């Protein structure tokens, strides 16, 4: 219910949920990835099997969509998959109503503006750079050979697509926060029992659809 910020000034007014949630989720993700890659065997053992299953999932969803050179963007789209996956599970699970904050709240990284618009902005910078790379440096995909009208709408869609994906992530995670907060504010938690399954299913497939939607748009960057 308190989603704005708290006054931890650092040169500009910065959001507190953004900072702490994204920092701790990146920290636990790298703590999971780093300690289990120290001593891996050639056989897919206990955690290495799970990590390699995730990575071959990313290999398939990156091989089917983009083009001939998806492998350097597999790190980007894979860290994006892992981020959305663990942040959705942490929003569904990790307790943040018993801990109280004097100025605001602390639920998830995508609840606020910054860590969804940052994903949109990084993807858009990647699309413009990859378009100036794979295509020439005079005119990127904007240039209109067949139709004499599509010239402004080309840059207009190249502007309105990242914000659209941002709004997708918004309308998912903010809706999920509303579900969980009003559903635990109803009464003692005998009611969330069937709804938790639907939330888990939607969160997992939310991670998957964000992954394939990043893949599709670096595919358009390739095109």
């Amino acid at each position: 219910v308190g989603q704005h910020f708290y006054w931890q000034i650092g040169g500009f007014q910065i959001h507190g949920q953004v900072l702490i949630t994204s920092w701790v989720v990146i920290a636990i993700l790298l703590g999971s990835a780093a300690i289990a890659v120290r001593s891996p065997q050639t056989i897919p053992t206990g955690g290495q099997n799970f990590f390699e299953y995730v990575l071959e999932f990313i290999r398939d969803v990156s091989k089917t969509q983009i083009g001939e050179e998806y492998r350097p963007w597999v790190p980007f789209i894979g860290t994006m998959f892992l981020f959305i996956f663990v942040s959705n599970w942490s929003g569904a699970l990790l307790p943040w109503k018993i801990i109280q904050l004097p100025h605001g709240e602390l639920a998830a990284p995508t609840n606020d503006i910054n860590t969804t618009v940052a994903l949109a902005l990084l993807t858009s910078v990647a699309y413009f750079y990859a378009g100036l790379t794979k295509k020439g440096l005079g005119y990127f995909g904007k240039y209109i050979q067949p139709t004499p009208i599509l010239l402004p709408i080309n840059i207009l869609e190249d502007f309105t697509k990242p914000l659209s994906l941002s709004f997708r992530l918004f309308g998912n995670i903010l809706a999920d926060e509303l579900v969980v907060v009003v559903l635990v504010s109803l009464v003692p938690l005998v009611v969330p029992i069937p709804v938790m399954f639907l939330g888990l299913f939607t969160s997992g497939i939310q991670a998957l659809i964000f992954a394939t939607l990043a893949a599709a748009y670096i595919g358009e960057s390739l095109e």
Binding site: V37, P40, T42, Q48, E52, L55, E56
Partner: protein, 56 residues
């Protein structure tokens, strides 16, 4: 996390390459096993006929 499956597939890769060069070597060695007795039998009849001319 990539080289671990790269190795497990590269084993099948080197295996199929080995069987290909193997089959090539099989046909070549059976060709030479035919060829050595064929060369002996042909050249011995050659020298037979040539020395038989001078014998006549």
């Amino acid at each position: 996390l990539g080289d671990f499956m790269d190795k497990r597939d590269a084993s099948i890769k080197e295996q199929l390459s080995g069987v290909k060069d193997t089959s090539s070597e099989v046909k070549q060695l059976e060709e030479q096993a035919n060829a050595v007795m064929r060369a002996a039998r042909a050249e011995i009849s050659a020298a037979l006929n040539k020395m038989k001319k001078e014998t006549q």
